[PDB]
Design a binder for this molecule. Structure first.
Ligand SMILES: C[S@@+](CC[C@H](N)C(=O)[O-])C[C@H]1O[C@@H](n2cnc3c(N)ncnc32)[C@H](O)[C@@H]1O
Ligand SMILES: C[S@@+](CC[C@H](N)C(=O)[O-])C[C@H]1O[C@@H](n2cnc3c(N)ncnc32)[C@H](O)[C@@H]1O
Lengths: 228, 244
């Protein structure tokens, strides 16, 4: 239990986010691997686009919920979805895919070392010319231009320029009855993940901001990465 | 090779053939006050200083009478320290113990009443290596001994995080930034116009504090201070102890 300065813990439809993934993939022949699929907040929208989806999830309990939802769906929908228990930071399906997909909530679950395991696992499950697509929440600090500081320093005079670039923040939530719950989660800057992707061998061909809920301020980025 | 910053991009473009871009840390043509912050918040006996470098802090510490063990990873840096230590008075020279080691995974046949590390040093370490540091420090602290850290504090790290309510309170807390610098001569001509760039890790002081608590320390004080004695307080002095 985290006792924030404002003192119980604390522990949305995926159609728009899913359509954004579909925009940045285009033709997609063959199956799509979705990492940390949860109970299908994105997977069901993906299936509705006609995609064949291998949905990977770590939790037994979450898998049961997903399986139940799938039993409730029409046969043609359920038939296009393959559920697999695994760890997105270290998995082996002995099988490659034209497209690999991961959501922001998912990637922000992993620390730095685990993200490297993720990147490497993905490399092993991409077919040549395959696409690795990520969505990433973008905070106010992450989208803003960094304030550059300038100082004149001395014999020879130099000008020093200093900027601080966003890398990682904590999203803190205190739930509050109006007349008290708690959560802190990781919030990586899209630019930080892009740096990490390049470092792990990927070329990042595009970063498209979008609105998670499909309207209003653009609060997310869709990153397309490919293997050279 | 070197980091190509937006301001560097435009400089080099508008300078042509005279322009040279290199990282700040290669071909490249403070201390006593940060040292005093440490001295102010501390001795019964020997101090351990981690990642001592060439002794920007260590020599100030030695001038206070301290027995210092200075741990450093780089062999050439240690050689350079040793050279500076050779020109030092015999009494200063005898109170200094130089040791080669990794501050993320080190083991000495000694414990200490005080262990110190500066901002530049802890920011060299990724998250995993920082956990290795905290565990190692705990093992080298005598009962009641203190772990003292100095931590650079950016403007975003210094500000009160912006809230947005709906009631649902949402704050975004700084955890880690990248400090990016660009340095060039104030003129334009010069003969060779060299532009230095560098990118480095810059942890939020509160993030390191969260990590220390998680690691088993009690953080008993955090005092902001100015790295050049005066001006904006751009640094925090953290004191941590083991509970018991
Ligand atoms: C914030 S949710 C995102 C789920 C979904 N893609 C969405 O957009 O709603 C993170 C999910 O990843 C799962 N998860 C956490 N770590 C995992 C791991 N290492 N491998 C696979 N799944 C993981 C959790 O069980 C949880 O269901
Ligand atoms: C920013 S300087 C700090 C030096 C000194 N404490 C000061 O305030 O001037 C970083 C120093 O840490 C050393 N270093 C880097 N990683 C290290 C490690 N894992 N263990 C010990 N020293 C390390 C480098 O060789 C360098 O001397």
């Amino acid at each position: 239990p985290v006792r924030t300065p404002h003192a119980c813990d604390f522990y949305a439809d995926g159609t728009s986010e899913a359509r954004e993934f579909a925009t940045r993939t285009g033709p997609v022949s063959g199956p799509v691997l979705e990492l940390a699929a949860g109970m299908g907040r994105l997977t069901f929208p993906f299936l509705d686009l006609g995609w064949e989806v291998t949905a990977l999830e770590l939790s037994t309990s979450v898998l049961a919920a997903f399986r139940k939802r799938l039993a409730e769906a029409p046969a043609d929908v359920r038939d296009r979805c393959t559920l697999v228990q695994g760890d997105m930071s270290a998995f082996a399906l002995d099988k490659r895919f034209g497209t690999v997909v991961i959501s922001s909530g998912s990637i922000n679950e992993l620390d730095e070392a685990d993200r490297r395991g993720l990147y490497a696992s993905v490399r092993e499950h991409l077919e040549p010319g395959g696409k690795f697509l990520l969505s990433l929440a973008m905070s106010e600090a992450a989208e803003s231009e960094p304030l550059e500081r300038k100082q004149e320093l001395p014999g020879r005079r130099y000008v020093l320029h200093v900027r601080h670039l966003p890398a990682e923040e904590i999203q803190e939530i205190t739930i509050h009855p109006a007349d008290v719950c708690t959560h802190r989660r990781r919030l990586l800057a899209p630019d930080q993940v892009v740096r990490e992707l390049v470092r792990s061998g990927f070329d990042v061909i595009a970063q498209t901001p979008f609105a998670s809920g499909g309207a209003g301020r653009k609060d997310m980025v869709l990153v397309e990465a490919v293997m050279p």
